[PDB]
Amino acid sequence: MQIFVKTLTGKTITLEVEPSDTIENVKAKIQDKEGIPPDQQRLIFAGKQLEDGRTLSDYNIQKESTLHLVLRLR
Amino acid sequence: MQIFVKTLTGKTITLEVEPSDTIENVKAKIQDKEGIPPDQQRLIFAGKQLEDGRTLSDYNIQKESTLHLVLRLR
Amino acid sequence: NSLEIEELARFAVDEHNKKENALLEFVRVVKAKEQIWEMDASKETMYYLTLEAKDGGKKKLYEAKVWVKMTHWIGAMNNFKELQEFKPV
Amino acid sequence: ENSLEIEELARFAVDEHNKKENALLEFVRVVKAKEQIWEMDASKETMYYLTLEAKDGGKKKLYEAKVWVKMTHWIGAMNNFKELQEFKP
């Protein structure tokens, strides 16, 4: 399926993923498409911080869902 | 000199640069330190979008000044 | 609400005036249309505001487009708004 | 930085704490406020340290919460990001 990842400003990218994919894999897609390192990506969904270990289905991230991305500069 | 780069959320890094240096070189420093490609970096100062061709002194970015960084997701 | 749209229109006028060193005097909001994106938490909004503003001193009609993204998660809230385009009728 | 904006930041802190720990705190009032502000030209970073009274079991108790609020505005847009940084008795 296709999901959205948006920043706080409303700039949007789209990644084709499967519910089996991991947040680490999503951040790898974001690195491949846009070039932002995964260690800088703090992903947000459903009023929760997303952990690199859990899957999209764990968070009930169905088709056409949108995640948010905040840069950390860690 | 030392300058600050913050995101819209308040995450902060510090870079050592010279007023002769260009915004392209600063964005390259951000790439080296934090890993964000310069093509994704939209740097803000004095309420202006910074052009990669001009220098820090052109925009009156004095020592210890603070810039803000917004992701572009090209 | 009409207050939040009034404030978004004053936002548009102020930011455009700062964008061109113009001095447009906000009068009122005549018509407002918006496109809204909703989700469990964030609410994305593109406002298509038709406002009245004074250019030389006499009222003129301008259409402003403001992008407003409110993102909040547990413990926090972000409110980003951005003037994306400003143009008269 | 005024008592209305502090009231709203305190209600933000109490509500977000309630959602973060599934607590049910009844906001009473803000007793003391301390703040740290950076006011760079066209930006305002603020860490609010508010000690407010709220009743957890029905009787008032005293909690200090610190909420981070960053107001970033540039020529075309403005961001208002706020984040509950700590809630503690």
Residue numbers in the entry:
A (entry chain A), B (entry chain C): 1 to 74
C (entry chain D): 33 to 121
D (entry chain B): 32 to 120
Give the exact sentences the study uses for this entry.
Ub can be ubiquitinated at any of eight primary amines (on the N-terminal amino group of M1 or the side chains of K6, K11, K27, K29, K33, K48, and K63), and all eight Ub linkage types co-exist in cells (Peng et al., 2003). Affimers are 12-kDa non-antibody scaffolds based on the cystatin fold (Tiede et al., 2014, Tiede et al., 2017), in which randomization of surface loops enables the generation of large (1010) libraries, against which epitopes can be screened and binders can be selected. To understand the observed linkage specificities, we determined crystal structures of the K6 and K33 affimers bound to their cognate diUb at 2.5 Å and 2.8 Å resolution, respectively. Both complexes show a conceptually similar interaction between affimers and diUb: each affimer molecule binds one Ub molecule and the affimer dimerizes to bind the two Ub moieties of a diUb in a linkage-specific manner. The variable loops are responsible for dimerization as well as Ub recognition, and specific dimerization provides two binding sites for Ub I44 patches with a defined distance and relative orientation, leading to specific, high-affinity recognition.
In the K33 affimer, the mode of dimerization is different. Both variable loops extend the existing β strands, which leads to the formation of an intermolecular β sheet. Ub interactions are mediated by the elongated β sheet and are centered on W105 that contacts the I44 patch. Additionally, E76 forms a salt bridge with K6 of Ub. Finally, we solved a 3.8-Å structure of the K33 affimer bound to K33 diUb in a different space group, which shows the same overall orientation and interactions. In contrast, the K33/K11 affimer is monomeric and only dimerizes upon diUb binding.
